């Protein structure tokens, strides 16, 4: 019965990632004064299916790899981590209810740079390796503000428990006491997933260009699973919905609408801005987000003490 | 028979998925690049056909040779063609890619890109309009729709 | 991260255009100029036409000159839409590309209504223009111009005060005025450096001394002031188009010398002299008196010049083509030093470089 | 007669400095750009439904070539080779002879459509309106030599498109 | 117009609605019509194992009330 | 236990999709390809700056590891000492960032 | 409320194509369900429609025949299927069909 | 002390906000009247069992029952 619950988690993940590609092409279409796909299916609803079947019978690109083993391991690690980030998510009840789910997600997202690094070294292109090193340095840079912002928010929660974060936000959204943390958090999640305006793997080579159409599609769907997941996590973390315990589907509808709007906000940010130069988002992290993040971490340490608003441990 | 019916339906499925998800790599060589950009512009909008705008050359399905092919760039064209995964198609757009065009008798122009790469659709014009190029892309989709890969495989 | 040396290898679109001009007549060599700066077609037509008309010692009629200035500024809108939106597209701002190519599609409809082709019109000829404006064209040019300032305003909303766009342009590619003059820069490449120079003002051609407009001048010599100069040149092109639509005169559109411009088809089929002149202008062509001119216009990329040498025959002996992008891409190596690799694509964008005119 | 783009000194009073700092810390122009992108989201797109909806053309449009006839069936081309003399790409190849009724007619009228620059100098050099460049732009082929039209193909394009070509010439002949 | 993107958003939203609805119904099916017992701390697990021992059917969720005493 | 089952299911589905993506188009018989990069054969030049930003990540990540028990440490009854040491750790992370600034360590990847 | 008028226009687009069957026919062939004034029909079965409230480019269209010159064109519609007398009207070279 | 402050707020508003929020976090808990209640609530939270005292006979402040008057109270927490 638990295996049914695991499958009803992870097969809808793959379906939502499949149709997120359609939603991105359509929304980026209408924001660019054109249409998106509307020929292949009715309203383009068969475009992800057609594209999956196209990519899974395309010729293998057949690279000469420096390592065969890490070239196999990098998509496996990417998909495994992108599927295990979902299991503590309280929506309203997590699959795995763990006491330290926030730190679990921070750890499993910190492990996601090995897929980039191993795929960059497993290619024989030196320029692909340079791009992989830039992508890893970007991701580990923004993980610093992820961890410190996330700590500063959970100083209002009381624990690392993700389900407690719903109880924390029953009277007000947590974006009201922590909107500067929310906006630096949101741009840091935008820079974690290598999402525009932080997508330098498409700014003028990607780390995974030596993969065939199948494995590059697996990297791509792990990336969009990370995108939907971080939007759900940001929704749980700052926009926590009403939860009637006798009617859990009210919370499920509410966090689903908010997470969809936040994923469309990712789609709407990539339809609006040019890219950063690489040093410019390094400047954005180290010289702008990190001093404010340390200052607000001092503020959110000292603030529950000075107002007598320390959250409970349990 | 059953096997002929099964390979016919699988041919229809894989031809549908290939012609409905064509990814182009456009050699924006010369003035035909401007008109390929108009075929991507919101009036015609290739992206609603499933034809994405500027896929990378190692994942694209069709090479649109849009412009004049000179002698100095013909090995680069052929190298990008050899780096494309199969099934790869070639749309020749406009007169210089088709036959040399207005620079046919030049010392430095390849007289049509079909001296360099095999070509599927010849799209005529100087430039052909964006609507004429979109006509050529839909004709390429119709050419993919009547492919018989698995039927010939079953009959061999 | 820094760039020490940038060596642009070109000739990938060298077509031997101006050797092919030597084996063709003057009317036959006119459509090569549509294909040099292939976003600025009728302007290069105008530069070649002014060169041949200077060597022929004839002048276009006034309505032909107003049609040439009208379509030159429509062409300038085409080229600066191409310039600004691809310069933003290569940096990452992909959305005003699609927002402005619908307006660019409508100006290609203007070209197609007046000539029959959307891009390579062969419309501005030595002697005037090929054919008169069809009825209702000026109404639709007015309907375009009445709304196009809002399109510039929302482009300028998306880019100008955007801090990501200002980080990618403000201290990038700084060119001094003396180095821009020494490197043969022209147009916006001079005008971002604060040099007050514009060939429509200083060395005016067809009726540009009769239209009223302003020249946008930069202050810092960078990518960002050149962006602002191109946006403001789209503004001033809308201004000149309004002045051309109001001050369009009646009359003929070819010069009324039928030994230079071909006669009308009604009188080609009626008059003996007109049939002879139609015959000889479409088989031999007109003879151009011997001499060498360097005729330059203010194309939307800068000074576009033709050094045309005639020997007295109906075919050009020599036609050297000065493109702005040739000297601009030569100065790319100086403009890219002390910058990063991602700045190089922005400097290649701020120099408006179309390789058809760069390579010929 | 000139203007200065970007020669503004920003005001240094506390009001304007706090305006610029609220812009820096609260991302006001970034919300402006998101607003303009959201504004195009709710517009009707400019996308026509090709092939069922077509781009607007004029009667001057220069597409596929056609040899025309008189209103008696006699072909208009009297073999004068003006079109191939003016042809800037040398796409037109003409051979002629007197035929059985002594008329001056072609035995070869070839147009290489892959040399052709579609500029229509042939249809304006033509004294009898024989060669025209008609309104067809949807004639893409699968083979290169299918774009090498001989006299039979061009006369068949004339017979195919004449009902449209005559009306386009009827619209535009008073400008020519 | 813009509402053409809403079918894909609807499909994706149903696909995001499925996991939480599924785990809520599976938790109510596996735990006697109630929520799953949250045992983050060893006292909660002690009470839960005591419930499993006092139920007599080796199921923690089968609750025994005042009817189980005299 | 349910966590180990879920990890095994996620890893098995990932390995199955990777096996399908590496071996479903291998069944085709397409063609043998001869096939004879911005740098040609020059050895990868070392960047000191990428190493410095990775080490700065590592040291700030250790300081983050010290900062991680604060939502538990706020529950103590020695709150003046706890608040003093929390502000002292975040201040020493800020002093590390300031020294990384002022000796030009955050330059050309600022 | 004006959303009710939008829903009524959608339902009368379903009604205008002759029911749900003709609605789905034109949806899967045209990728387009708006109704127009039937301007005419050629000798092949192509049906030519106006709608002058649509913008310039959408205001004239053709629903192609399902069989032309022996070829099944139910799914294989083609821009060259338009005869020349309707090719001036459809491409807006004239106001007159 | 005022021209330098407007200068750094014009040039570097991120860092001015950073040092200002950090200064408030430093100085404001010493000026707050509610810092005392944080301590009082953390000591009012009964994690352990209240191990009772052997009644020697003379302990007037220790109750015999939870509902007795003597002993530590939490009226301040319910009221605040
Ligand atoms: C979670 C739901 C969504 C959350 C909100 C996010 C929605 C909006 C997103 C818009 C699209 C953004 C795309 C990416 C943008 C990247 C660029 C960018 O913005 O860079 C950040 C910019 C960078 O600025 P910059 O780099 O342009 O500035 C120049 C900086 N120097 C001089 C160093 C070169 O700003 C920040 O870093 C600010 C981050 C947030 C700060 C929040 C401060 C709150 C107020 C604190 C108190 C202030 C008063 C003082 C104390 C008073 C005490 C009483
Ligand atoms: C869940 C996500 C999507 C899942 C994957 C997509 C679903 C459909 C998967 C099966 C599609 C059909 C087989 C793959 C496509 C074959 C394309 C091709 O070129 O075939 C020619 C190839 C080779 O045929 P050939 O002999 O003509 O080779 C062509 C190449 N030359 C001539 C140069 C040697 O056919 C096969 O390899 C046959 C494969 C098995 C046929 C189908 C079996 C049942 C499948 C269920
Ligand atoms: C620079 C360091 C500045 C802060 C020093 C410690 C401040 C503080 O709160 O100390 C009280 C704390 C704790 O005191 P306390 O008052 O909480 O002690 C009560 C007893 N316990 C801990 C069981 C609840 O530390 C000490 O008193 C001793 C340790 C620090 C001694 C000084 C080290 C100086 C090193 C210089 C090099
Ligand atoms: C959580 C929800 C998730 C939902 C995911 C899916 C979203 C999109 C749903 C589908 C949308 C509509 C699909 C319509 C498909 C096209 C049908 C069609 O018309 O096919 C025509 C084609 C040829 O027909 P023919 O008979 O030749 O025509 C000549 C007639 N004189 O005939 C054929 O091609 C043969 C028939 C093909 C039918 C394919 C149907 C679509 C497959 C969808 C798969 C997913 C279904 C939902 C799964 C989740 C719910 C269980
Ligand atoms: C034993 C017998 C069976 C043997 C094995 C076959 C298994 C089933 C495979 C699918 C059904 C077989 C037929 C496939 C389609 C054939 C018909 C076809 O191509 O119809 C064309 C029609 C659209 O017409 P079109 O040519 O595109 O015209 C353009 C518009 N002017 O096209 C349409 O209307 C849409 C066609 C959609 C095709 C089916 C839907 C996609 C496939 C779904 C199942 C597989 C993938 C599952 C999910 C993968 C991961 C996302
Ligand atoms: C290259 C190799 C292959 C790469 C791809 C696959 C590996 C990477 C992706 C998967 C990563 C596995 C992570 C496993 C541990 C995660 C941490 C963890 O267990 O946290 C959850 C929870 C802690 O919370 P708490 O509620 O306090 O504990 C329960 C108390 N009621 O604690 C629990 O619930 C405890 C449950 C029992 C203990 C579980 C032990 C798991 C098995 C050992 C580690 C497996 C991974 C080894 C390889 C790592 C990557 C190389
Ligand atoms: C006491 C409380 C705790 C304080 C420590 C904790 C702070 C939390 C935030 C952490 C910040 C870590 C990094 C700080 C580095 C400071 C040095 C620095 O950045 O100097 C360089 C800078 C000029 O920048 P530049 O080198 O040109 O870089 C390119 C960008 N233009 O130079 C400058 O911009 C000048 C910066 C100094 C002046 C800032 C004044 C802010 C005043 C706010 C009001 C007072 C708040 C109370 C605290 C006292 C502040 C002096
Ligand atoms: C298990 C496999 C599920 C289906 C595959 C993922 C869903 C389809 C995504 C298709 C796709 C789109 C639209 C796409 O645009 C794209 O290019 C950026 C891809 O990467 C190569 C894609 O994979
Ligand atoms: S066919 Fe014509 S317009 Fe096209 S690239 Fe060639 S010269 Fe330019
Ligand atoms: S359109 Fe021009 S290039 Fe083509 S055949 Fe006529 S004259 Fe020659
Ligand atoms: S088509 Fe016209 S110009 Fe050409 S040979 Fe015939 S009559 Fe002369």
């Amino acid at each position: 019965m638990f295996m049914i619950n695991v499958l009803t988690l992870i097969i809808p993940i793959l379906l939502a990632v499949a149709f997120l590609t359609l939603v991105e092409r359509k929304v980026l279409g209408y924001m660019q004064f054109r249409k998106g796909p509307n020929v292949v299916g009715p309203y383009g609803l068969l475009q992800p299916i057609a594209d999956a079947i196209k990519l899974f019978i395309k010729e293998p690109l057949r690279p000469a790899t420096s390592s065969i083993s890490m070239f196999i391991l990098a998509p496996i690690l990417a998909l495994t981590l992108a599927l295990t980030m979902w299991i503590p998510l309280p929506m309203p009840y997590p699959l795995i209810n763990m006491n330290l789910g926030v730190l679990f997600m921070l750890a499993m997202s910190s492990l996601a740079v090995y897929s980039i690094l191993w795929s960059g070294w497993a290619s024989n292109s030196k320029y692909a390796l340079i791009g992989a090193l830039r992508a890893v340095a970007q991701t580990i840079s923004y993980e610093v503000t992820l961890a410190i912002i996330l700590l500063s928010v959970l100083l209002m929660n009381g624990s690392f428990t993700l389900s407690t974060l719903i109880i924390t936000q029953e009277q007000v959204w947590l974006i009201f006491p922590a909107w500067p943390l929310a906006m630096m958090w949101f741009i840091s999640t935008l820079a974690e997933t290598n999402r525009a305006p932080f997508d330098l793997t498409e700014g003028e080579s990607g780390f995974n260009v030596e993969y065939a159409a199948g494995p590059f599609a697996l990297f791509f769907m792990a990336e969009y699973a990370n995108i939907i997941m971080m939007n759900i996590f940001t929704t749980t973390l700052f926009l926590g919905a009403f939860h009637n315990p006798y009617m859990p589907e009210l919370y499920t509808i509410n966090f689903t609408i908010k997470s969809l709007l936040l994923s469309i906000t990712f789609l709407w940010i990539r339809a609006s801005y040019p890219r950063f130069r690489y040093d410019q988002l390094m400047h954005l992290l180290w010289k702008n987000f990190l001093p404010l993040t340390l200052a607000l971490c001092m503020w959110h340490v000292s603030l529950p003490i000075l107002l007598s608003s320390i959250p409970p441990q349990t | 028979s059953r096997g002929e019916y099964v390979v016919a339906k699988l041919d229809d499925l894989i031809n549908w998925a290939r012609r409905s998800s064509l990814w182009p790599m456009t050699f924006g060589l010369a003035c035909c690049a401007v008109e390929m950009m108009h075929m991507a512009a919101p009036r015609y909008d290739m992206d609603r056909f499933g034809v994405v705008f500027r896929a990378s050359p190692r994942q694209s399905d069709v090479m649109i040779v849009a412009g004049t092919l000179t002698n100095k760039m013909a090995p680069a064209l052929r190298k990008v063609y050899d780096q494309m995964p199969e099934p790869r198609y070639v749309v020749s757009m406009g007169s210089c890619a088709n036959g040399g065009g207005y620079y046919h008798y030049s010392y430095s122009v390849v007289r049509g890109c079909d001296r360099i790469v095999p070509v599927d659709i010849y799209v005529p014009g100087c430039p052909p309009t964006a609507e004429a190029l979109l006509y050529g892309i839909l004709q390429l989709q119709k050419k993919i729709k009547r492919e018989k890969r698995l039927r010939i495989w079953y009959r061999r | 991260e820094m760039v020490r040396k940038c060596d642009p290898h070109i000739g990938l679109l060298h077509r031997g255009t101006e050797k092919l001009i030597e084996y063709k007549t003057y009317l036959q060599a006119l459509p090569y100029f549509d294909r040099l700066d292939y976003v600025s077609m009728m302007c290069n037509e105008q530069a070649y036409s002014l060169a041949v008309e200077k060597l022929l010692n004839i002048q276009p009629p006034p309505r032909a000159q107003w049609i040439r200035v009208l379509f030159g500024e429509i062409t300038r809108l085409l080229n600066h839409i191409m310039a600004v939106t691809t310069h933003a597209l290569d940096i990452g701002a992909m959305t005003p590309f699609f927002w402005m190519f619908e307006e660019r599609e409508k100006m290609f409809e203007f070209y197609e209504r007046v000539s029959g082709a959307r891009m390579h019109a062969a419309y501005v000829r030595p002697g005037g223009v090929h054919q008169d404006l069809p009825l209702g064209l000026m109404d639709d040019i007015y309907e375009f111009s009445k709304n196009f300032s809002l399109r510039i305003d929302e482009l300028e909303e998306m880019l100008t005060n955007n801090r990501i766009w200002r980080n990618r342009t403000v201290d990038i590619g700084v060119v001094t005025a003396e180095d821009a003059l020494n490197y043969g820069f022209s147009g916006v490449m001079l005008r971002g450096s604060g040099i007050q120079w514009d060939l429509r003002k200083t060395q005016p051609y067809d009726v540009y001394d009769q239209v009223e407009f302003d020249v946008p001048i930069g202050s810092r010599g960078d990518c960002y002031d050149r962006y602002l100069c191109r946006v403001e040149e789209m503004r001033q092109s809308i201004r000149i188009i309004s002045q051309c639509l109001n001050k369009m005169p009646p009359g003929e559109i070819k010069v009324d010398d039928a030994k230079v411009s071909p006669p009308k088809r009604a009188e080609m089929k009626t008059s003996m002299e007109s049939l002879i002149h139609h015959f000889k202008l479409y088989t031999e062509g007109y003879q151009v008196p011997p001499g060498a001119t360097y005729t330059a216009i203010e194309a939307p990329k800068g000074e576009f010049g033709v050094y045309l040498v005639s020997d007295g025959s109906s075919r050009p002996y020599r036609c050297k083509i000065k493109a702005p992008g040739f000297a601009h891409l030569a100065g790319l190596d100086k403009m890219s030093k002390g910058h990063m690799l991602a700045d190089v694509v922005a400097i290649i964008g701020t120099q408006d470089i179309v390789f058809g005119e760069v390579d010929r | 007669t000139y203007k200065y783009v970007n020669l503004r000194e920003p005001s240094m009073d506390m009001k304007s400095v706090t305006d610029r700092a609220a812009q820096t810390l609260l991302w006001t122009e970034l919300i402006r750009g998101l607003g303009m992108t959201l504004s195009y989201l709710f517009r009707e797109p400019a996308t026509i439904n090709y092939p069922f909806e077509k781009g607007p053309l004029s009667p001057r449009f220069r597409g596929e070539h056609a040899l025309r006839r008189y209103p008696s069936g006699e072909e208009r081309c009297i073999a004068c080779k003006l079109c191939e003399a003016v042809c800037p790409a040398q796409a037109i190849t003409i051979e002629a002879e007197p035929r059985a009724d002594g008329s001056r007619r072609t035995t070869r009228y070839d147009i290489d459509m892959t040399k052709c620059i579609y500029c229509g100098f042939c249809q304006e050099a033509c004294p009898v309106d024989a060669i025209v460049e008609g309104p067809n732009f949807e004639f893409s082929t699968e083979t290169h030599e299918e774009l090498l039209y001989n006299k039979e193909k061009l006369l068949n394009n004339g017979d195919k498109w004449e009902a449209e070509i005559a009306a386009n010439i009827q619209a535009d002949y008073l400008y020519r | 117009m813009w509402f053409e993107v809403l079918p894909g958003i609807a499909v994706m939203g149903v696909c995001l609605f499925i996991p939480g609805m599924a785990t809520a119904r599976i938790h109510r099916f596996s735990n006697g019509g109630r929520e799953k017992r949250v045992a983050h701390y060893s006292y909660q697990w002690y009470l839960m194992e005591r419930d499993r021992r006092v139920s007599g059917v080796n199921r923690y969720y089968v609750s025994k009330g005042l009817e189980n005493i005299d | 236990m349910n966590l180990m089952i879920t990890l095994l299911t996620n890893f098995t589905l990932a390995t199955l999709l990777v096996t399908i993506a590496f071996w479903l188009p291998q069944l085709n018989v397409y063609s043998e390809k001869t096939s004879p990069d911005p740098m040609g054969s020059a050895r990868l030049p070392f960047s000191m700056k990428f190493f410095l930003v990775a080490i700065t990540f590592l040291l700030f990540d250790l300081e983050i590891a010290l900062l991680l028990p604060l939502p538990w440490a706020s529950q103590t009854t020695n709150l003046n000492t706890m608040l003093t040491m929390a502000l002292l750790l975040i201040f020493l992370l800020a002093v590390s960032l300031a020294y990384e600034w002022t000796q030009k360590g955050l330059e050309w990847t600022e | 409320m004006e959303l009710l008028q939008v829903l009524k226009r959608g339902l009368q687009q379903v009604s205008g194509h002759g029911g749900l069957r003709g609605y789905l026919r034109v949806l899967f062939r045209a990728n387009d369900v708006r109704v127009g004034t039937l301007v005419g029909e050629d000798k092949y079965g192509n049906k030519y429609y106006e709608d002058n409230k649509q913008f310039f480019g959408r205001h004239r269209w053709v629903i192609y025949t399902t069989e032309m010159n022996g070829k099944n064109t139910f799914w294989d519609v083609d821009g060259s299927m338009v005869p020349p007398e309707w090719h001036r009207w459809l491409h807006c070279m004239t106001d007159d069909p | 002390v005022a021209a330098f402050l407007k200068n750094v707020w014009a040039k570097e508003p991120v860092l001015v906000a950073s040092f200002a929020i950090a200064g408030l976090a430093v100085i404001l808990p010493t000026l707050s009247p509610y810092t005392k209640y944080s301590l009082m609530i953390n000591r009012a939270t009964p994690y352990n069992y209240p191990v009772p005292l052997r009644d020697d006979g003379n302990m007037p402040d220790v109750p015999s029952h939870p509902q007795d008057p003597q002993g530590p109270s939490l009226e301040w927490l319910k009221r605040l």
Side-chain angles (χ1 to χ4, degrees), chain A residues 46 49 52-53, chain B residues 5 10 12-13 16 19 145, chain G residues 29 75 77:
Chain A
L46 273 302
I49 293 96
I53 299 171
Chain B
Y5 180 78
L10 287 175
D12 289 334
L13 181 63
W16 176 74
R19 74 177 180 268
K145 183 171 183 177
Chain G
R29 293 185 69 240
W75 298 109
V77 297

Side-chain angles (χ1 to χ4, degrees), chain F residues 76-82 84-85 88 92:
Chain F
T76 190
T77 320
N78 194 2
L79 279 177
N80 290 318
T81 303
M82 175 265 168
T84 304
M85 304 319 290
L88 187 62
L92 286 173

Side-chain angles (χ1 to χ4, degrees), chain B residues 35 43-44 127-132, chain C residues 105 108-119 134 140, chain D residues 48 50 53-64 133-139 161 164 168 171-172, chain G residues 56-57 59-60 79 86-95:
Chain B
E35 203 78 32
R43 176 172 292 177
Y44 294 104
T129 64
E131 199 173 3
Chain C
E105 181 71 30
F108 280 176
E109 283 181 350
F110 290 153
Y111 276 15
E112 189 270 330
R113 289 179 67 187
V114 80
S115 68
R118 289 173 57 181
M119 283 176 61
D140 289 333
Chain D
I48 65 170
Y50 189 77
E53 294 167 351
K54 298 291 184 67
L57 294 176
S58 70
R60 297 189 184 182
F61 176 71
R62 303 202 298 266
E64 191 177 6
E133 193 169 1
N136 192 6
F137 60 96
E138 290 166 346
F139 63 109
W161 295 96
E164 182 168 6
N168 288 318
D172 199 70
Chain G
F56 182 65
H59 71 292
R60 296 180 183 181
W86 290 99
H87 190 276
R88 280 174 75 245
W89 183 79
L90 182 63
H91 292 275
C92 299
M93 298 180 186
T94 183
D95 289 328

Side-chain angles (χ1 to χ4, degrees), chain A residues 184 283-284 287-293 295, chain C residues 163, chain D residues 21 24-25 27, chain F residues 101, chain H residues 8-9 11-21:
Chain A
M184 291 188 290
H283 178 82
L284 181 62
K287 299 191 178 180
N288 299 111
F289 281 180
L290 185 56
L292 285 167
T293 302
Chain C
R163 71 186 70 184
Chain D
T24 302
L25 291 175
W27 303 348
Chain F
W101 192 293
Chain H
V8 66
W9 180 243
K11 295 191 289 185
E12 300 288 328
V14 173
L15 293 176
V16 176
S18 297
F19 286 107
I21 293 165

Side-chain angles (χ1 to χ4, degrees), chain C residues 75-116:
Chain C
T75 304
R76 195 176 299 272
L77 292 177
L78 292 170
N79 194 359
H80 294 303
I81 284 171
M82 177 63 75
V84 169
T85 58
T86 56
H87 171 60
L89 176 65
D90 292 332
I91 294 172
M94 63 181 177
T95 311
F97 171 77
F98 293 93
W99 293 358
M100 297 300 284
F101 275 20
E102 180 63 29
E103 307 295 321
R104 193 165 191 271
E105 181 71 30
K106 289 185 283 185
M107 287 183 284
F108 280 176
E109 283 181 350
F110 290 153
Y111 276 15
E112 189 270 330
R113 289 179 67 187
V114 80
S115 68

